[PDB]
């Protein structure tokens, strides 16, 4: 396409500003990826081992780095436009550098988008398995290799205002107090142990972390199944004491929200990068005819491909 000098300058300025936006997009996506990684730092235990969600932040970091690199290359292109004599030394390398940047950015961003659109689906079953594993490992606070289970579960509950995967009730059905701290001399404890199969100690209670600060009354953590166990509690849904929603639910919603935001960021960054690379390639092919001299008004033709498409097919 015949490109006159004034539109050439205007397009160079537009490419400069577009590359600035691309660098900003790379920065923000890198920040979001780091945020997701640090969030996953204290959440991996709750993810099923077979899950591969944590790989998405890893891929997104590389995608953002490549996007920022392309933005910096666009800034360099703007500088070369400012100083024509500064381009020639950056002529031979520019072609292969642009080609490699296009390939890498496209691959990384496409991989990131695919991961953002595929991995979140598995999060449901991933959390389903992981939270159950953590709860089953809650009791053994003394056994090595799982000591962090209790602390991590309690921190999760307190931070994200949740109780169990979904709800709290049948928490009574999972033992959450290490048998080491049970008094063998309690007739009721012995009777419960004998009655329940497998010897597990099941009690109508919940750990402190399950409480809700909003509760007007002090939190209740025992005999929750009985209506008369306390002056005012009843089976009717109480706003007080424990939380309403469940961990699995809250975590799934939050992680899906983060994944959707990251995917939207990836899509916008991909569009911006595609536009920036298209503009830079047009600028390069246009100035190739000019020989790197901006002042030249020879009206060079700017075409995306070096030659005809059929030529590329034949060269294959």
């Amino acid at each position, epitope marked *: 396409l015949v490109l006159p000098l004034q539109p050439r300058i205007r397009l160079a300025q537009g490419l400069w500003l577009l590359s600035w936006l691309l660098a900003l997009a790379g920065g923000v996506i890198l920040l979001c990826s780091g945020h997701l990684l640090v969030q996953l730092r204290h959440l991996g235990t709750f993810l099923a081992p077979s899950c591969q969600f944590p790989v998405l932040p890893q891929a997104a970091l590389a995608a953002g780095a490549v996007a920022l690199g392309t933005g910096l290359v666009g800034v360099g292109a703007s500088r070369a436009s400012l100083n024509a004599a500064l381009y020639p030394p950056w002529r031979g390398v520019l072609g292969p550098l642009l080609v490699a940047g296009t390939a890498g950015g496209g691959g990384l961003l496409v991989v990131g988008l695919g991961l953002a659109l595929a991995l979140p689906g598995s999060l449901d079953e991933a959390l389903e398995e992981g*939270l*159950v594993t953590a709860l089953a490992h809650y009791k053994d606070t003394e056994v090595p290799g799982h000591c962090q289970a209790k602390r991590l579960v309690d921190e999760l509950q307190l931070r994200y205002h949740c109780c*169990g*995967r*979904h*709800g*709290y*009730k*049948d*928490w*009574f*059905g*999972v033992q959450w107090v290490s048998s080491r701290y049970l008094d063998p001399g309690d007739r009721d404890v012995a009777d419960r142990i004998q009655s329940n199969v497998e010897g597990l100690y*099941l009690t*109508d209670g919940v750990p402190f972390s399950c409480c809700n600060p909003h509760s007007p009354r002090p939190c209740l953590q025992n005999r929750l*199944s009985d209506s008369y166990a306390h002056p005012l509690f009843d*089976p*009717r*849904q109480p706003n007080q004491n424990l939380w309403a929603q*469940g961990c*699995h639910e809250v975590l799934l919603e939050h992680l899906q929200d983060l994944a959707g935001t990251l995917g939207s960021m990836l899509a916008v960054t991909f569009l911006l990068q595609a536009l920036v690379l298209l503009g830079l390639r047009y600028l390069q092919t246009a100035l190739e005819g000019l020989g790197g001299v901006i002042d030249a008004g020879g009206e060079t033709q700017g075409y995306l491909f070096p030659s005809g498409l059929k030529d590329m097919l034949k060269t294959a």
Partner: nanobody
Framework: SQVQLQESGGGLVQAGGSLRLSCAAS????????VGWFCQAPGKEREFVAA????????WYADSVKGRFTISRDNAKNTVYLQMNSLKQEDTAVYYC???????????????????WGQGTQVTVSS
């Protein structure tokens, strides 16, 4: 006010026969209630038989009766149906339908959890 659960369908049957039991609530929120059934006979304590939860695609029964029983829900009528199939004399017992507020991660249930309990119905199987 306080919810009331009513059970019906209990009656005499012969060995190997089938039966239908219907438990009905009174509130309009039944779609979210998690429901279960228990059977108890003299000389034995309350035991789990069948469960249904929010999703409606989840059904769980005691291993001793796996498959032999069926449990379903009808939100339109706010009813819980249980079909007895291939009954045996030992199944003779009083059944209680129980409804509870959402407890949606222990797909298995025990009497310690449920809140609303119906009176129940006695079913006897004769050879």
């Amino acid at each position: 006010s306080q919810v009331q659960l009513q059970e019906s369908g209990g009656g005499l049957v012969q060995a190997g026969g089938s039966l239908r039991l219907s438990c009905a609530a009174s509130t309009r929120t039944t779609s979210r209630y998690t429901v279960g059934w228990f059977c108890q006979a003299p000389g034995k304590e309350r035991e789990f038989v069948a469960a249904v939860h929010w999703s409606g695609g989840s059904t769980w029964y005691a291993d001793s009766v796996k498959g032999r029983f069926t449990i379903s829900r009808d939100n339109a009528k706010n009813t819980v149906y249980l079909q007895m199939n291939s009954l045996k004399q030992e199944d003779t017992a009083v059944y209680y339908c129980a409804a509870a507020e959402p407890r949606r991660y222990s797909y298995y249930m025990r009497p310690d959890e449920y809140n609303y309990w119906g009176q129940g119905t006695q079913v006897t199987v004769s050879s």
